[PDB]
Design a protein around this nucleic acid. Structure first.
Ligand SMILES: [Zn+2]
Ligand SMILES: [Zn+2]
Lengths: 114, 56, 413, 45, 106, 48, 61, 98, 136
RNA sequence: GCUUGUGCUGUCUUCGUCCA
């Protein structure tokens, strides 16, 4: 797994472009030899691609404008693989009826409401 | 929340850089902390040295 | 017209259609200075009004942009900015006015012009003194240094008169120290110095006798031949053109891991271009470059053998003065490159939406307008964000305490 | 209430702090205030 | 407008789920032959962690997310909301065990 | 507050007879009057 | 008065304006600009008319 | 407000040419608006809504107002220039040279 | 600033030989020719060449602000059309030995009278003096 | 019956003055 720094707010765009290129080049003489790619909202500015060769990463990033000029790629440690996909604030279970909450704005700004 | 060690290292180096350039912005061998106008930040050390410094 | 073609390509596959999008720059159109009011009307501007109302005396610049849509299966005047006008010049409104209308316009007939009016303030450009380009200068390095003499040349293309590259030929080894007195040549985009014999072979002249034929011009001078002997001994290890080019290509500061053939091509590129660019730029024209290298080495040897004094740095016939023309040309080159990059970025962003852009929206005239206005108003002769580490005082407020002081300020360097 | 004078055609007019600063007849954008009415005295020295 | 299918984890537009169904979960949810009810309950528009998979068979990420037997496309690490009890019981009738991707179950 | 502040005044006696001025300071009888042509301010009793 | 009304009044009086030194200088400058535009466009017919008009307007004292 | 005088200004906030001016006197009167305080508790005509931004004459200078210019800037707001004139007579301590 | 292409054309017209036809052993007495700091060729009769270039510049064929320099000691002949060179004018003394006017100024009272009148006897100003060969 | 109001930016750059 390699991680590459990209411009802020374009991570999902890079993910979709990588998926589109992988689908388009599938079944060709030189297909995009990658396996998966993703990103996390909390880990801003990082795009993680799972592959086996650095040339595959270079081919995947070729033709993209959100990637910075320098090859800001690093090797993700194997122990970090589980941490990259661990969930966050998932235990929570929506709002509960009958609870007392406060109002952020409006004419009743700050009044407690059930 | 969640701890990828590389991101911890990046943000903690950013914190170290901010604390270091808050006191000394003339560190040799690294770029200076700059203002939005491009002028360098006036650190505490630069307030105390030179003809216009606190002492002289 | 220096960079007249912006090019965008897109090998669309979504039926392979290779599409090239390119825009050409045409003619430049200038006008007399105009003033645009808040209510929307326009009228001809004169310098007294600009002085009284704190306006800028400047004129719009228009450029013809032509767009073409190339596709292979396998456009009018755009306003690019406002340039301040120098008073009493060919493009000033006061050039034509005779003595009577000059009085009616509240202009003094004794006023001579030669300045600009930025925000109602009179600014004068001060001539900048620089050393001449394309001349060989040989200097003596000081004692606490292995180098004893240096031969440096700064190269500038005739079109535009802009510095490109600097090449030095150092003479290592002190008198009776450091064993042999080797001559190493510094090359652009090369991390470590190179002996003269290796680069001479790389240009395409292998035999050592012909290297001496190029360098020296009188065989009976045994002293210069003796001084060149250590260089021949050091360069004897290389004996072929291609290995010499490869040796150039390893140190060429490029990305690590480049293949041998690509290294040789990179050496050929960095040798044809950026090595004495003022001589020539085309292929197979390296004979003149070899002769000029021989000339530089001959000058270095002539100075090193105490046959001639080192060049006078303070000689005034080796200096040049930059007036309003060259300074504004350099500034306009920087600002136009910035505007072209902005147009490129906007075009790249717009092709995502796939629309027939007007091309009157990509151009930001505020770039050139604000850059010229800032540089003339503050005197910092560079980009506003690059104000730190930039030349200052190039533009000053005109002195008006007395007539003689105004004349002196207008003729200063 | 206050008198002015045009910078081009030297025409006199008045403004009421609500009109645009312009000459009435020739539309110049530059106008000048008129001299005061207070007594002006000098010591001739 | 895009929604993340709760069962298989794929992310597709909600109208794509309404018109064509989920290409993987159609065998047990019949999403292509169902109303907006099943689309709304089995797919959620609130998610996090967009994932694009090219080769399901050899990707360790696909095995870790249990999506190596599904169609390549957009996937979500975490999906807000869980499948209802009746749908869980229906899946248990088919012999398939449902493991929630909401993160709250581990 | 005196009713003579910031009012045009004329001097009738002394060494500055017949000079137009403006009252700037008036505390006790010694009115301070600026002179229109000489760029100066001079003390003067209210009687003058 | 508004800006548009003031400009309309100024244009009306300019139409009524028989002659004014400032306006004659401005018109002569505008004619000179039009003349240099015609000269740079290699229009040998317009430039003669502009020169004749300038000769008629000119010859001041 | 400032410590200088304001009686030399006209209705439009500008001094007129021909008037004597001393140091600190106000020659251009300008105000900027300010969100009013709780003075809406009742202040019939004496509740402050403006802050003074007037231009005084230099404290060391005095003279006569020579010319007052009024126009509009590039953006479209008003724009004033006031010129002061004075005569300087040679005295002990003035510098001369051949 | 002036273009260097007419200078190269004039030099090639008057017998300058390019660098590719140059052998340093054979040319032990030829003069190197530089144009704007670029060694462009060689010549074996520099006297006639410098005389022709100077006469052409004095007649207005070459721009008056072009530099024509002959270094006899170093066997070099340099020409500059660069921008930024500071120059001053001087009277020209007739240095031709074969002429009767040797050692005398080229400018006469006829030139002064023409300058005072303002026109030639079948505008006569400073540029007329410069292109007549009496000032350079 | 009517009473007088109480203060000031910062940072650079340039040009100068008197010594040296
Ligand atoms: Zn008028
Ligand atoms: Zn599904």
């Amino acid at each position: 797994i390699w991680g590459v720094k990209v411009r802020l707010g374009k991570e999902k765009d890079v993910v979709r472009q990588i998926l589109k290129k992988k689908l388009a080049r599938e079944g060709t003489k030189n297909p995009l030899e990658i396996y998966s790619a993703f990103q996390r909202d909390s880990f801003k500015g990082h795009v993680y691609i799972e592959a086996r060769k650095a040339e595959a990463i270079n081919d995947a990033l070729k033709g993209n404008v959100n990637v910075f000029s320098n090859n800001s790629k690093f090797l993700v440690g194997i122990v970090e693989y589980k941490d990259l996909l661990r969930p966050v604030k998932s235990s929570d279970v929506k709002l509960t009826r009958g609870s007392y909450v406060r109002v952020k704005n409006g004419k009743f700004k700050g009044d407690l409401a059930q | 929340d969640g701890s990828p060690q590389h991101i911890i290292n990046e943000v903690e180096q950013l914190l170290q850089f901010h604390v270091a350039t808050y006191m000394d912005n003339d560190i040799a061998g690294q770029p200076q902390a700059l203002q939005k106008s491009g002028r360098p930040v006036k650190a505490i050390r630069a307030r105390l040295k030179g003809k216009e410094g606190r002492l002289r | 017209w220096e960079e007249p073609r912006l090019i965008l390509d897109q090998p669309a596959q979504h039926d392979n259609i290779n599409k090239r999008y390119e825009i050409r720059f045409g003619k430049i159109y200038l006008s007399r200075p105009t003033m645009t009011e808040a209510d929307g009307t326009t009228h001809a501007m004169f310098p007294q009004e600009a002085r009284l109302r704190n306006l800028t005396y400047s004129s719009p610049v228009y450029l013809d942009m032509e767009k073409s849509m190339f596709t292979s299966i396998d456009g009018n005047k755009v306003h690019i900015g406002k340039v301040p006008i120098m008073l009493r010049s060919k493009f000033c409104s006061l050039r034509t006015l005779d003595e009577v209308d000059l009085y009616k316009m509240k202009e003094c007939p004794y006023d001579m012009g030669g300045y600009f009016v930025i925000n109602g303030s009179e600014k004068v450009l001060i001539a900048q003194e620089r050393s001449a380009a394309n001349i060989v200068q040989v200097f003596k390095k000081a004692a606490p240094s292995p180098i004893s003499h240096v031969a440096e040349i700064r190269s500038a293309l005739e079109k535009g008169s802009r510095l490109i590259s600097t090449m030095q030929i150092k003479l290592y080894g002190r008198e009776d120290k450091g064993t042999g007195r080797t001559i190493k040549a510094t090359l652009p985009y090369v991390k470590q110095d190179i002996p003269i014999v290796i680069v001479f072979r790389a240009l395409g002249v292998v035999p050592d006798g012909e290297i001496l034929q190029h360098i020296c011009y009188d065989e009976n001078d045994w002293q210069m031949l003796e001084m060149l002997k250590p260089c021949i001994e050091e360069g004897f290890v290389i004996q072929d053109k291609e290995v010499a080019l490869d040796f150039i290509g390893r140190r060429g500061s490029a990305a690590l891991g480049i293949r041998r053939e690509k290294r040789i091509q990179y050496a050929k590129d960095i040798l044809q271009k950026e090595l004495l660019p003022h001589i020539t730029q085309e292929e197979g024209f390296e004979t003149r470059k070899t002769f000029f290298l021989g000339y530089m080495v001959n000058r270095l040897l002539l100075c090193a053998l105490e046959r001639k004094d080192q060049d006078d740095r303070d000689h005034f016939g080796k200096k040049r003065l930059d007036l309003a023309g060259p300074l504004l040309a350099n500034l306009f080159r920087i600002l136009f490159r910035k505007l072209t990059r902005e147009i490129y970025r906007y075009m790249q962003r717009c092709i995502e939406t796939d629309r027939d852009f007007n091309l009157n929206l990509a151009v930001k005239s505020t770039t050139i307008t604000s850059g010229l206005k800032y540089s003339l108003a503050t005197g910092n002769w560079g980009e506003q964000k690059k104000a730190m580490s930039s030349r200052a005082g190039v533009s000053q407020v005109l002195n008006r305490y007395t007539y003689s002081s105004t004349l002196s300020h207008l003729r200063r360097t | 209430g206050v008198k002015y004078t045009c910078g081009a055609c030297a025409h006199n007019f008045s403004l009421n702090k609500s009109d645009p600063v312009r000459c009435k007849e020739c539309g110049h954008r530059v106008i000048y205030k008129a001299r005061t009415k207070r007594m002006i005295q000098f010591d001739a020295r | 407008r895009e929604r993340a299918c709760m069962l298989c984890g794929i992310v597709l537009p909600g109208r794509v789920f309404m018109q064509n169904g989920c290409p993987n979960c159609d065998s047990v949810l019949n999403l292509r032959d169902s109303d907006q009810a099943t689309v709304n309950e089995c797919t959620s528009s609130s998610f996090e962690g967009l994932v694009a998979v090219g080769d399901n068979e050899h990707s360790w990420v696909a095995k870790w997310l249990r999506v190596d037997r599904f169609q390549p496309g957009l996937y979500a690490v975490r999906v807000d909301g869980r499948l209802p009890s009746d749908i869980v019981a229906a899946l248990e009738q088919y012999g398939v065990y449902y493991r929630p991707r909401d993160g709250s179950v581990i | 507050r005196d009713p003579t502040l910031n009012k045009t005044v004329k001097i009738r006696q002394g060494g500055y007879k017949g000079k137009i001025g403006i009252v700037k300071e008036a505390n006790g009888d010694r009115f301070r009057v600026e002179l229109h042509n000489p760029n100066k301010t001079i003390p003067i009793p209210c009687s003058f | 008065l508004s800006n548009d009304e003031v400009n309309s009044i100024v244009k009306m009086k300019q139409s009524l304006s028989s002659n004014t030194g400032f306006n004659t200088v401005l018109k002569k400058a505008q004619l000179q600009e039009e003349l240099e535009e015609a000269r740079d466009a290699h229009d040998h017919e317009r430039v003669a008319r502009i020169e004749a008009e300038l000769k008629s307007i000119g010859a001041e004292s | 407000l400032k410590h200088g005088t304001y009686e030399k200004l006209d209705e439009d906030g500008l001094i007129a040419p021909g008037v004597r001016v001393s140091g600190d006197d106000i020659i251009i009167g300008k105000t900027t608006p300010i969100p009013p305080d709780t003075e809406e508790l009742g202040q019939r005509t004496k509740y402050h809504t403006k802050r003074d931004a007037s231009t005084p004459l230099r404290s060391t200078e005095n003279g006569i107002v020579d010319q007052v210019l009024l126009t509009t800037n590039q953006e479209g707001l008003k724009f004033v220039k006031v010129r002061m004139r004075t005569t300087k007579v040679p005295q002990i301590g003035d510098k001369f040279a051949s | 600033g002036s273009p260097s292409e007419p200078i190269i054309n004039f030099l090639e017209e008057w017998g300058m030989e390019p660098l590719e036809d140059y052998d340093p052993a054979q040319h032990t007495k030829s003069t190197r020719i530089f144009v704007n700091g670029v060694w462009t060729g060689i010549h074996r009769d520099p006297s006639m060449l410098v005389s022709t270039m100077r006469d052409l510049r004095r007649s207005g064929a070459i721009s008056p602000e072009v530099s024509i320099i002959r270094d006899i000691r170093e066997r070099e002949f340099k020409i500059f059309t660069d921008v930024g060179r500071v120059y001053r004018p001087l009277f020209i003394v007739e240095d031709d030995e074969s002429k009767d006017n040797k050692g005398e100024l080229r400018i006469t009272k006829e030139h002064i009278r023409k300058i005072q009148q303002g026109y030639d006897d079948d505008v006569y100003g400073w540029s007329s003096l410069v292109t007549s060969g009496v000032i350079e």
